[PDB]
Ligand binder design. Sequence first.
Ligand SMILES: Nc1nc2nc(C(=O)N[C@@H](Cc3ccc(O)cc3)C(=O)O)cnc2c(=O)[nH]1
Ligand SMILES: Nc1nc2nc(C(=O)N[C@@H](Cc3ccc(O)cc3)C(=O)O)cnc2c(=O)[nH]1
Length: 263
Amino acid sequence: QYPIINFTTAGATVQSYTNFIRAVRGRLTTGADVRHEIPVLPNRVGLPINQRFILVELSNHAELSVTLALDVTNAYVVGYRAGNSAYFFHPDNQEDAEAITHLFTDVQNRYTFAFGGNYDRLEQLAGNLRENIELGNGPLEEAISALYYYSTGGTQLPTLARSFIICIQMISEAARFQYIEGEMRTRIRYNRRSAPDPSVITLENSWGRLSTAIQESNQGAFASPIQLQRRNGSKFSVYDVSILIPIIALMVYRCAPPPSSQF
Ligand SMILES: Nc1nc2nc(C(=O)N[C@@H](Cc3ccc(O)cc3)C(=O)O)cnc2c(=O)[nH]1
Ligand SMILES: Nc1nc2nc(C(=O)N[C@@H](Cc3ccc(O)cc3)C(=O)O)cnc2c(=O)[nH]1
């Protein structure tokens, strides 16, 4: 029922990863909502359940597969399937809890984690912050295996949390930001794993605020500047949507777009 996008870390290249992220974005957004050349994800309000999720099937060189479920309203990884078991993060509300009952319905064993899936909680469980977790094709390859082996006792909870952190950034954050996609492309091109620099972290942390600022902007101009960080940690002030067009690929729906003003 829900659309499936396939990616493998086995012999992954810049092009195969680029194709993957493009395909994810195409299934996340409908094309209905584009503001200042930036697509907006579907509004949660009134969105039919048959349109709520996409599936990302990850394979690796170890010949293992896991399937991540992503909420189209926010690109959030809500859970995953590995073989005969599915695992869902603790839902943040009642209707998100109802929504996940529509996923992996044929699976033998259904589990809801007692913990939520936000970075704060996952970092706590991993025993490491995002700034100290390596990203790249190698980490993703290993993350797929770790997710796969969780149900049989092979994967410690900190490793599982770390693996989620890897998946979320290389899939969801890359889909949200061309900039983060670009950083992942670089790691793949050279087969060199590295932890995300402050430009990556601050973009991830600011996605909600950037989405709202763009959507509330006066003809693209922010009422309040947003402070980001560069690769070297130095401050970068954002005053306008214009500078974000090459950086942000998708926004979360925050408000209705204002009417055009006919001059
Ligand atoms: N499973 C899953 N989890 C996710 N979790 C986050 C996440 O935790 N974002 C943070 C950003 C933030 C962090 C710290 C701050 O001080 C401020 C903002 C937030 O909204 O709280 C983002 N994306 C996903 C995602 O796609 N899938
Ligand atoms: N399906 C689903 N969605 C969820 N979405 C959030 C969440 O943080 N939502 C934000 C949107 C947002 C997302 C990522 C960010 O980095 C920043 C903002 C909000 O409601 O404003 C937390 N949990 C869940 C969850 O369990 N299940």
